[PDB]
Scaffold this active site. Sequence first.
Site, PDB file in Angstrom:
ATOM      1  N   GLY A   1       5.417  24.704   5.305  1.00 47.98           N
ATOM      2  CA  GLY A   1       4.077  25.203   5.061  1.00 47.98           C
ATOM      3  C   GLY A   1       3.395  24.538   3.882  1.00 47.98           C
TER       4      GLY A   1
ATOM      5  CE  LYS B   1      -5.425  13.856   4.469  1.00 43.82           C
ATOM      6  NZ  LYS B   1      -4.111  14.107   3.801  1.00 43.82           N
TER       7      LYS B   1
ATOM      8  CB  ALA C   1      -0.385  19.275   1.756  1.00 46.09           C
ATOM      9  CB  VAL C   2       3.191  17.112   5.133  1.00 40.75           C
ATOM     10  CG1 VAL C   2       3.551  16.330   6.394  1.00 40.75           C
ATOM     11  CG2 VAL C   2       3.069  16.158   3.946  1.00 40.75           C
TER      12      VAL C   2
ATOM     13  CB  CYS D   1      -0.869   7.014  -0.214  1.00 45.33           C
ATOM     14  SG  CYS D   1      -2.461   7.854  -0.505  1.00 45.33           S
TER      15      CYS D   1
ATOM     16  CG  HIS E   1     -30.089  26.851  -4.499  1.00 43.44           C
ATOM     17  ND1 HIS E   1     -29.132  27.805  -4.228  1.00 43.44           N
ATOM     18  CD2 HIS E   1     -31.110  27.087  -3.642  1.00 43.44           C
ATOM     19  CE1 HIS E   1     -29.556  28.585  -3.251  1.00 43.44           C
ATOM     20  NE2 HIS E   1     -30.754  28.173  -2.877  1.00 43.44           N
TER      21      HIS E   1
ATOM     22  CB  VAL F   1      11.478  20.874   4.830  1.00 45.58           C
ATOM     23  CG1 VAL F   1      11.412  21.672   6.124  1.00 45.58           C
ATOM     24  CG2 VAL F   1      12.461  19.720   4.967  1.00 45.58           C
TER      25      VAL F   1
ATOM     26  N   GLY G   1       0.787  -1.221   0.000  1.00 51.72           N
ATOM     27  CA  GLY G   1       0.000   0.000   0.000  1.00 51.72           C
ATOM     28  C   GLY G   1       0.821   1.275   0.000  1.00 51.72           C
TER      29      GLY G   1
ATOM     30  CB  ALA H   1      13.571  -5.222  -5.682  1.00 48.11           C
TER      31      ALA H   1
HETATM   32  C1  FAD Z   1       1.799  12.701   5.985  1.00 49.18           C
HETATM   33  C2  FAD Z   1       1.545  12.611   4.492  1.00 49.18           C
HETATM   34  C3  FAD Z   1       0.292  12.914   3.991  1.00 49.18           C
HETATM   35  C4  FAD Z   1       0.016  12.839   2.596  1.00 49.18           C
HETATM   36  N1  FAD Z   1      -1.268  13.152   2.182  1.00 49.18           N
HETATM   37  C5  FAD Z   1      -1.541  13.084   0.852  1.00 49.18           C
HETATM   38  C6  FAD Z   1      -2.879  13.396   0.356  1.00 49.18           C
HETATM   39  O1  FAD Z   1      -3.799  13.722   1.074  1.00 49.18           O
HETATM   40  N2  FAD Z   1      -3.085  13.309  -1.012  1.00 49.18           N
HETATM   41  C7  FAD Z   1      -2.037  12.929  -1.905  1.00 49.18           C
HETATM   42  O2  FAD Z   1      -2.313  12.889  -3.062  1.00 49.18           O
HETATM   43  N3  FAD Z   1      -0.816  12.634  -1.467  1.00 49.18           N
HETATM   44  C8  FAD Z   1      -0.520  12.691  -0.132  1.00 49.18           C
HETATM   45  N4  FAD Z   1       0.737  12.378   0.290  1.00 49.18           N
HETATM   46  C9  FAD Z   1       1.773  11.959  -0.702  1.00 49.18           C
HETATM   47  C10 FAD Z   1       1.466  10.489  -1.169  1.00 49.18           C
HETATM   48  O3  FAD Z   1       1.510   9.653  -0.007  1.00 49.18           O
HETATM   49  C11 FAD Z   1       2.510  10.059  -2.195  1.00 49.18           C
HETATM   50  O4  FAD Z   1       2.433  10.924  -3.322  1.00 49.18           O
HETATM   51  C12 FAD Z   1       2.242   8.631  -2.690  1.00 49.18           C
HETATM   52  O5  FAD Z   1       2.292   7.668  -1.603  1.00 49.18           O
HETATM   53  C13 FAD Z   1       3.297   8.292  -3.724  1.00 49.18           C
HETATM   54  O6  FAD Z   1       3.022   6.824  -4.241  1.00 49.18           O
HETATM   55  P1  FAD Z   1       4.182   6.008  -4.790  1.00 49.18           P
HETATM   56  O7  FAD Z   1       3.461   4.741  -5.317  1.00 49.18           O
HETATM   57  O8  FAD Z   1       4.950   6.701  -5.733  1.00 49.18           O
HETATM   58  O9  FAD Z   1       5.124   5.715  -3.666  1.00 49.18           O
HETATM   59  P2  FAD Z   1       5.031   5.169  -2.157  1.00 49.18           P
HETATM   60  O10 FAD Z   1       3.617   5.140  -1.698  1.00 49.18           O
HETATM   61  O11 FAD Z   1       6.003   5.691  -1.355  1.00 49.18           O
HETATM   62  O12 FAD Z   1       5.293   3.667  -2.241  1.00 49.18           O
HETATM   63  C14 FAD Z   1       6.578   3.108  -2.694  1.00 49.18           C
HETATM   64  C15 FAD Z   1       6.622   1.656  -2.150  1.00 49.18           C
HETATM   65  O13 FAD Z   1       7.884   1.066  -2.624  1.00 49.18           O
HETATM   66  C16 FAD Z   1       8.429   0.279  -1.509  1.00 49.18           C
HETATM   67  N5  FAD Z   1       9.833   0.192  -1.906  1.00 49.18           N
HETATM   68  C17 FAD Z   1      10.738   1.228  -2.016  1.00 49.18           C
HETATM   69  N6  FAD Z   1      11.938   0.823  -2.419  1.00 49.18           N
HETATM   70  C18 FAD Z   1      11.815  -0.536  -2.579  1.00 49.18           C
HETATM   71  C19 FAD Z   1      12.776  -1.563  -3.013  1.00 49.18           C
HETATM   72  N7  FAD Z   1      14.014  -1.315  -3.349  1.00 49.18           N
HETATM   73  N8  FAD Z   1      12.271  -2.849  -3.050  1.00 49.18           N
HETATM   74  C20 FAD Z   1      10.979  -3.154  -2.711  1.00 49.18           C
HETATM   75  N9  FAD Z   1      10.032  -2.277  -2.309  1.00 49.18           N
HETATM   76  C21 FAD Z   1      10.501  -0.976  -2.259  1.00 49.18           C
HETATM   77  C22 FAD Z   1       8.073   1.105  -0.319  1.00 49.18           C
HETATM   78  O14 FAD Z   1       8.215   0.349   0.853  1.00 49.18           O
HETATM   79  C23 FAD Z   1       6.628   1.488  -0.624  1.00 49.18           C
HETATM   80  O15 FAD Z   1       5.632   0.657  -0.119  1.00 49.18           O
HETATM   81  C24 FAD Z   1       1.078  12.436   1.697  1.00 49.18           C
HETATM   82  C25 FAD Z   1       2.361  12.122   2.192  1.00 49.18           C
HETATM   83  C26 FAD Z   1       2.621  12.199   3.578  1.00 49.18           C
HETATM   84  C27 FAD Z   1       4.014  11.851   4.062  1.00 49.18           C
HETATM   85  C1  FAD Z   2     -39.501  21.332   2.720  1.00 50.43           C
HETATM   86  C2  FAD Z   2     -38.975  21.652   1.333  1.00 50.43           C
HETATM   87  C3  FAD Z   2     -37.642  21.428   1.034  1.00 50.43           C
HETATM   88  C4  FAD Z   2     -37.117  21.717  -0.257  1.00 50.43           C
HETATM   89  N1  FAD Z   2     -35.772  21.464  -0.473  1.00 50.43           N
HETATM   90  C5  FAD Z   2     -35.264  21.733  -1.704  1.00 50.43           C
HETATM   91  C6  FAD Z   2     -33.855  21.489  -1.986  1.00 50.43           C
HETATM   92  O1  FAD Z   2     -33.079  21.053  -1.164  1.00 50.43           O
HETATM   93  N2  FAD Z   2     -33.401  21.780  -3.267  1.00 50.43           N
HETATM   94  C7  FAD Z   2     -34.277  22.297  -4.271  1.00 50.43           C
HETATM   95  O2  FAD Z   2     -33.797  22.511  -5.343  1.00 50.43           O
HETATM   96  N3  FAD Z   2     -35.560  22.530  -4.023  1.00 50.43           N
HETATM   97  C8  FAD Z   2     -36.097  22.273  -2.789  1.00 50.43           C
HETATM   98  N4  FAD Z   2     -37.417  22.527  -2.557  1.00 50.43           N
HETATM   99  C9  FAD Z   2     -38.265  23.096  -3.644  1.00 50.43           C
HETATM  100  C10 FAD Z   2     -37.908  24.615  -3.816  1.00 50.43           C
HETATM  101  O3  FAD Z   2     -38.182  25.264  -2.569  1.00 50.43           O
HETATM  102  C11 FAD Z   2     -38.756  25.211  -4.936  1.00 50.43           C
HETATM  103  O4  FAD Z   2     -38.464  24.527  -6.154  1.00 50.43           O
HETATM  104  C12 FAD Z   2     -38.423  26.696  -5.139  1.00 50.43           C
HETATM  105  O5  FAD Z   2     -38.684  27.476  -3.940  1.00 50.43           O
HETATM  106  C13 FAD Z   2     -39.273  27.213  -6.284  1.00 50.43           C
HETATM  107  O6  FAD Z   2     -38.933  28.743  -6.500  1.00 50.43           O
HETATM  108  P1  FAD Z   2     -39.995  29.645  -7.094  1.00 50.43           P
HETATM  109  O7  FAD Z   2     -39.230  30.973  -7.279  1.00 50.43           O
HETATM  110  O8  FAD Z   2     -40.587  29.121  -8.249  1.00 50.43           O
HETATM  111  O9  FAD Z   2     -41.119  29.750  -6.115  1.00 50.43           O
HETATM  112  P2  FAD Z   2     -41.298  30.049  -4.554  1.00 50.43           P
HETATM  113  O10 FAD Z   2     -39.989  30.020  -3.861  1.00 50.43           O
HETATM  114  O11 FAD Z   2     -42.374  29.411  -4.025  1.00 50.43           O
HETATM  115  O12 FAD Z   2     -41.583  31.551  -4.446  1.00 50.43           O
HETATM  116  C14 FAD Z   2     -42.776  32.178  -5.028  1.00 50.43           C
HETATM  117  C15 FAD Z   2     -42.966  33.504  -4.254  1.00 50.43           C
HETATM  118  O13 FAD Z   2     -44.133  34.166  -4.848  1.00 50.43           O
HETATM  119  C16 FAD Z   2     -44.896  34.754  -3.741  1.00 50.43           C
HETATM  120  N5  FAD Z   2     -46.203  34.927  -4.372  1.00 50.43           N
HETATM  121  C17 FAD Z   2     -47.061  33.941  -4.808  1.00 50.43           C
HETATM  122  N6  FAD Z   2     -48.175  34.434  -5.355  1.00 50.43           N
HETATM  123  C18 FAD Z   2     -48.035  35.798  -5.271  1.00 50.43           C
HETATM  124  C19 FAD Z   2     -48.908  36.904  -5.702  1.00 50.43           C
HETATM  125  N7  FAD Z   2     -50.064  36.741  -6.292  1.00 50.43           N
HETATM  126  N8  FAD Z   2     -48.415  38.165  -5.440  1.00 50.43           N
HETATM  127  C20 FAD Z   2     -47.207  38.383  -4.828  1.00 50.43           C
HETATM  128  N9  FAD Z   2     -46.345  37.430  -4.406  1.00 50.43           N
HETATM  129  C21 FAD Z   2     -46.804  36.151  -4.652  1.00 50.43           C
HETATM  130  C22 FAD Z   2     -44.755  33.731  -2.666  1.00 50.43           C
HETATM  131  O14 FAD Z   2     -45.145  34.271  -1.434  1.00 50.43           O
HETATM  132  C23 FAD Z   2     -43.268  33.397  -2.746  1.00 50.43           C
HETATM  133  O15 FAD Z   2     -42.410  34.118  -1.918  1.00 50.43           O
HETATM  134  C24 FAD Z   2     -38.005  22.256  -1.265  1.00 50.43           C
HETATM  135  C25 FAD Z   2     -39.361  22.493  -0.977  1.00 50.43           C
HETATM  136  C26 FAD Z   2     -39.874  22.203   0.307  1.00 50.43           C
HETATM  137  C27 FAD Z   2     -41.340  22.476   0.566  1.00 50.43           C
END
Ligand code: FAD
Ligand code: FAD
Lengths: 460, 460
Positions: B174, B50, B176-177, B41, B437, B264, B38, B112
């Site tokens: 400074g 992580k 990611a690590v 990483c 949204h 570093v 592995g 190796a």
């Molecule tokens: C604390 C930390 C956090 C990190 N976080 C992230 C992250 O969030 N996202 C990200 O993308 N990267 C992250 N990285 C970097 C990431 O871990 C490396 O880029 C990645 O592991 C590189 O993969 P690799 O296959 O090249 O080498 P490595 O994973 O190092 O693996 C090489 C392997 O070869 C083996 N090996 C070496 N020489 C020999 C040999 N002669 N014979 C047999 N086996 C051998 C080793 O034992 C090892 O298992 C992080 C690194 C650290 C130190």
């Molecule tokens: C519990 C719940 C959760 C939801 N969660 C999501 C979600 O996560 N993601 C998503 O995409 N959608 C969600 N929806 C649906 C989303 O809320 C609607 O699709 C969106 O609000 C529609 O926008 P609209 O502008 O068409 O109408 P509306 O937001 O209903 O607004 C119409 C407005 O016109 C006013 N109005 C009406 N008639 C008149 C009139 N004659 N004169 C003056 N003013 C008037 C009303 O008072 C109101 O303020 C959810 C709905 C509910 C009920």
Amino acid sequence: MKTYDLIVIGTGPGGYHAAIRAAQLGLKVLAVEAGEVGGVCLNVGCIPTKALLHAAETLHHLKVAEGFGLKAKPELDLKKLGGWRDQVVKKLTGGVGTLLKGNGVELLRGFARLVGPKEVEVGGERYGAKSLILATGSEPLELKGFPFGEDVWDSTRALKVEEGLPKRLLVIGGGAVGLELGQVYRRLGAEVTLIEYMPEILPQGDPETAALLRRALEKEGIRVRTKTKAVGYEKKKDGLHVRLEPAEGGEGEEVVVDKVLVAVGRKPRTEGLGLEKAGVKVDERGFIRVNARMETSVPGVYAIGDAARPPLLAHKAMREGLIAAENAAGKDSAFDYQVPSVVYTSPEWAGVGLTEEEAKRAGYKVKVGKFPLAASGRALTLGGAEGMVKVVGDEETDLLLGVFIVGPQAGELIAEAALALEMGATLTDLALTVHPHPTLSESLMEAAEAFHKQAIHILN
Amino acid sequence: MKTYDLIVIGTGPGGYHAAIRAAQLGLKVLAVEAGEVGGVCLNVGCIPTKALLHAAETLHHLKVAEGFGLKAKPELDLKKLGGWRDQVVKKLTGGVGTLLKGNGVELLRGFARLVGPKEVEVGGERYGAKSLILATGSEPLELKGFPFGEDVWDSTRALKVEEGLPKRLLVIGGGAVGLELGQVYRRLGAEVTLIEYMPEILPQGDPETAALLRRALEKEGIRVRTKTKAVGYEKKKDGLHVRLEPAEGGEGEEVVVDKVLVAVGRKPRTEGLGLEKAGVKVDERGFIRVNARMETSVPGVYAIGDAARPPLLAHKAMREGLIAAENAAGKDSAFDYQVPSVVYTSPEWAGVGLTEEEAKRAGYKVKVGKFPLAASGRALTLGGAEGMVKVVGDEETDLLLGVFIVGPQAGELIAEAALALEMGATLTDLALTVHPHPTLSESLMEAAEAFHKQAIHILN
Ligand SMILES: Cc1cc2nc3c(=O)[nH]c(=O)nc-3n(C[C@H](O)[C@H](O)[C@H](O)COP(=O)(O)OP(=O)(O)OC[C@H]3O[C@@H](n4cnc5c(N)ncnc54)[C@H](O)[C@@H]3O)c2cc1C
Ligand SMILES: Cc1cc2nc3c(=O)[nH]c(=O)nc-3n(C[C@H](O)[C@H](O)[C@H](O)COP(=O)(O)OP(=O)(O)OC[C@H]3O[C@@H](n4cnc5c(N)ncnc54)[C@H](O)[C@@H]3O)c2cc1C
């Protein structure tokens, strides 16, 4: 009568986007709002629900955290939670108001009703404009046998967790709203039963990933009953006795709960809007008929968001508002985009593009690639890998057709899939992109590799 | 002498990807590993770090959570935390071993050393192959004046938080690590001072977003000193007295700490590998010289990962392993990809493509778009909402050149940017994609709108 270049009715996601984009393009705009600025999404939808879900996930994860030495005796103050939720909402709606003002948009508070093709009446006063954008949104759809009241809540009432948590809750509807609020209540200690009329939750989404989400919710204690419907109920001293029956009807089955949350859909707010006085056509479902330019049957009158057509999503409404605004400004814009959908439960569910069945129906030679989060190093470092990524594509052309994800951050990862579809990406394009390691995003790259039968972290 | 189609030295990200892809292509492969399967990483890098960061973030967020009614009296068992870290590592390394076996790759444990162009010696036995892939990785770079020992740790030692936390820690580096481990120790209660030789942390990354990360860390109590170097130290009764000076040399300033973590850089493991017996050319820094096909100076011998060239990242090593394996199998593959980079601190930092400076030197007419997370609804529903997204593009062609992100989930959002660059996306393409949204991903879409001076959620 005051005149403007454009009058926008509604200030939800769609309405405020239309008003601001129109203002940026030099138009004098009037925005009318009958309730709170920001609409449903900011006030009683997206925002408050996501806030509650975040608090619930933070609480839930603490149990997982015990696994890595973090012992805690968490005490959740619902009153404080409700207060924070309200604060988040206020900050965001206040922000939109500031945005409208800063853009020169005039804000009028009142209920607008059309009296003609280009004339609106508000509080007895008349306002006119050469263009009108109807963004009135929707409201909770009522269910026969379950009229809204003290014991039958809509999503808005369900948000108020600080007003007493019910011991038992029945959620009717297996869509995003029902699933999200259902999980919130479960994680807060309530007994939750959720029923869905269709064979699987999220009926319009990929059945496989949807099933995985259902399984995760069931593991948390939520009783999910598919192919089931609620006929009616009877209120007794020991609770509400609700009658359940098979989808197509059949043998009755009782379930007793304290409250019922009805989340079976939305109804567009198009009645009593004066559309019949302006000549604006509306379909049988109540949606204002529009074309790709978001224009209605009346020249110069546009409709957007939930009031115009499903899917009822915020980002969709936002984009439609920009399109309508641009067209009102004289440009040539049209809506032709891939719209993703997200469920903010834990794990999250997200999808964009075509399901396997839709792709097949479309004539493509469907092929799929899957990558389980059980094989994700990142998922493990986050305390547990629950989920999967499924990519749908054409085996002959290698074209990416759809992507479905279930797991943490699914909603953030789906944007990459959306962009891929908009760019006409192939599965090879997706696999060739070097995703950072270790991340959950890597699952998309690996699912593409699996599609080509050469995934590395899983046997092919 | 035992013969194979391919011999892979090292089973880190690069090595096991090469071994598995080669096996999938029908080659008889022998993988040699001197330590734990592995590589860095999975054993002492990405994964364990992580895992610790996740635990630290879970603990830290409890402070913000108090804001929404979540009251807790956290107690962190460092021994249990270390045990979990070990479990995660064991599960993943065990998984790679299972994948190698499942793919028919023969695993030999030992160190190796090449004895010829196509012959390797392990444990006194000889092995040969038509192709050789060198994936030996790297090791912690030692710093003059700070030899590794009981008081001067490398990243591997720093991972063992269960062996006692120092009251005061000095982190040299400074990158990611250093930043990640520095934040882990600070969140665990240690006083932390971090120094960086260059003018800003993450020297090769966008300085604007890098500075925001630095400020976020400083807000948590981490003393960060850029343009600074550590010359040496003296062990006294009260601790380690370290002498700091301006990077270019100057007046000294002493800081007293209990332990020093040297982060570093890394040194490629290419010495004592028998390269001088095989004719494989190595550069001044110790990296094996390779072209885009990952080919060394010796036909049939490839080098990948940390041993081949910087940046020293896992996803890069993984992709290089696939390329080398494919070419060893007779195909024609080459590395010509955008490589993103991520820092898993909180907030996270991520980048891909060109910085403003690099784009300017490249001749592009640099233009940028910025979006503050303070304007993100999703960020607010997740509690803290600090960070920003910056997109770099060409004014004349509208081509996207680079993307830099600082904030929650930055590492998960950068893949969308990587895909965009690979697809030759313009800022218009990015803005036109309908992002869900409310999500943090929306910030990329809005930054693109800001680039065009028409963002909706901020004044332009
Ligand atoms: C604390 C930390 C956090 C990190 N976080 C992230 C992250 O969030 N996202 C990200 O993308 N990267 C992250 N990285 C970097 C990431 O871990 C490396 O880029 C990645 O592991 C590189 O993969 P690799 O296959 O090249 O080498 P490595 O994973 O190092 O693996 C090489 C392997 O070869 C083996 N090996 C070496 N020489 C020999 C040999 N002669 N014979 C047999 N086996 C051998 C080793 O034992 C090892 O298992 C992080 C690194 C650290 C130190
Ligand atoms: C519990 C719940 C959760 C939801 N969660 C999501 C979600 O996560 N993601 C998503 O995409 N959608 C969600 N929806 C649906 C989303 O809320 C609607 O699709 C969106 O609000 C529609 O926008 P609209 O502008 O068409 O109408 P509306 O937001 O209903 O607004 C119409 C407005 O016109 C006013 N109005 C009406 N008639 C008149 C009139 N004659 N004169 C003056 N003013 C008037 C009303 O008072 C109101 O303020 C959810 C709905 C509910 C009920």
